[PDB]
């Protein structure tokens, strides 16, 4: 059957000390009855107030990005800094960083591999653009992305790896992927992992969907076979995120 | 006479909660009896712990980078988020960001303008590479960098602007610029500001030198007429930074 579902919150570059406090207080008041790993990925700045205020036992804290090593990299944050700060989860290879901030398939693969070695739980992001999908290159783009990541990983590493399939055309556009569209892609990814790494890993691997997930469409999306949770953007800054957590059965 | 000197600490991508705490305690114990603005630029992660422990009345806290607006930019920190966090100083356009993270002259300029418009005090970094200096391209390179910035600025904006001249061949290499090397570049930069923006702005403008600045060489460096302080990297992670503060006479 399905492995433990994951309800990850990608706040991206948003939030004030007051606004995020209210969300955290709400998350702390929420009664979650089923086995699901809730994840809050705030900015580096808000990591401190989140570490202190978030007390719900099913919630963990993540960073939204990092680099491999500490050193002469002004503006950046490294994995050892995050590990020293008590952060054990991290989102890597998001479409916004692939597009805006020059993170190729290999650069993402190196970051994921370096995070796994450091002991991080990694939410690795893959997905095609509207341009790539219409040109019939969804499969060759997504599989190439995860293949690059897989190339720098050992079989034992995948226990600390979570794939977040996020079609760029669904990223905060309102154009949520059809339950079949999400299922068909997740099935393809899981099929690839089963053939190249192992059927056991593919069974344990958790493939999340990201792309305009909200309280209305979450339940029917998770009802699909190869959907193991969500990476939520816009709706994670709202009380609506609770419904998405509940939508993980 | 010179404008109010500035001793800025660029910790870059370094530091643990422990190591930085001890360093701040030292900065807090430091006796400073002359008018100088001391600046601590930590990673986004360490901003909170720096904001709670840094106490010296001549010290302010800065960020090492930011994007203009909040929104769908995973892994990044925006200016409104920083301002909400009580951080009002910021380092922008560092050579490491210009090289590694696609920060062109116009990207840097737009960031500075947005920061100034947000009420930030800005340390804007410019500097040529070694190969550019050997080919005699120093003047055209650095003055184009500051011209791009000046393009998006009004005359009154320069009160919230600080220029840090940092030759790339001196950045964390140990190859510090000679006293006359720094003076020539700073005289060139100031002369440009005088002609293109105004002599009054140029007089009040503070031009800091960065690049292998330590406790030993900082004294003779500040003696130069157009050196108004320092932006320190490696030595800022050391007790040596204390001497660099006093080196501003």
UniProtKB/Swiss-Prot annotation, chains A, B:
Pathway(s) the chain acts in: Carbohydrate biosynthesis; gluconeogenesis; Carbohydrate degradation; glycolysis; D-glyceraldehyde 3-phosphate from glycerone phosphate: step 1/1
GO molecular function: triose-phosphate isomerase activity
EC number of the protein: 5.3.1.1
Enzyme class: isomerase
Keywords: Gluconeogenesis, Glycolysis, Glycosome, Isomerase, Peroxisome
InterPro entries, alphabetized: Aldolase_TIM, TIM_sf, TrioseP_Isoase_bac/euk, Triosephosphate_isomerase, Triosephosphate_isomerase_AS
Single biological process term from Gene Ontology: glycolytic process
Keyword hit for Cytoplasm: no
Record keyword Endoplasmic reticulum present: no
Residues annotated as the enzyme's active site: 94, 166
GO cellular component: cytoplasm; cytosol; glycosome
Subunit relationships: Homodimer.
Similarity section: Belongs to the triosephosphate isomerase family.
Protein name per Swiss-Prot or TrEMBL: Triosephosphate isomerase, glycosomal
């Amino acid at each position: 059957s399905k492995p433990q579902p994951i309800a990850a919150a990608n706040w991206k570059c948003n939030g004030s000390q007051q606004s995020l406090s209210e969300l955290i207080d709400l998350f702390n008041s929420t009664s979650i009855n089923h086995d699901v790993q809730c994840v809050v990925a705030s900015t580096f700045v808000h990591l401190a107030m989140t570490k202190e205020r978030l007390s719900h036992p099913k919630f963990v804290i993540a960073a939204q990005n990092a680099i491999a090593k500490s050193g002469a990299f002004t503006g950046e944050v490294s994995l050892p800094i995050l590990k020293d700060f008590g952060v054990n989860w991290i989102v890597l290879g998001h479409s916004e960083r692939r597009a805006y901030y020059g993170e190729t398939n290999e650069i993402v693969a190196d970051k994921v591999a370096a995070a796994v070695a450091s002991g991080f739980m990694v939410i690795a992001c893959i997905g095609e653009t509207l341009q790539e999908r219409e040109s019939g290159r969804t499969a060759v783009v997504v599989l190439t992305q995860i293949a690059a990541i897989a190339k720098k990983l050992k079989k034992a590493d995948w226990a600390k790896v979570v794939i977040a399939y996020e079609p760029v055309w669904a990223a905060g556009t309102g154009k949520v992927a059809t339950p079949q569209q999400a299922q068909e892609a997740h099935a393809l990814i899981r099929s690839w992992v089963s053939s190249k790494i192992g059927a056991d890993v593919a069974g344990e691997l958790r493939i999340l969907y990201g792309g305009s997930v909200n309280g209305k469409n979450a339940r029917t999306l998770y009802q699909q076979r190869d959907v193991n949770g969500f990476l939520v953007g816009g709706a994670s800054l709202k009380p609506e995120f609770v419904d998405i957590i509940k939508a993980t059965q």
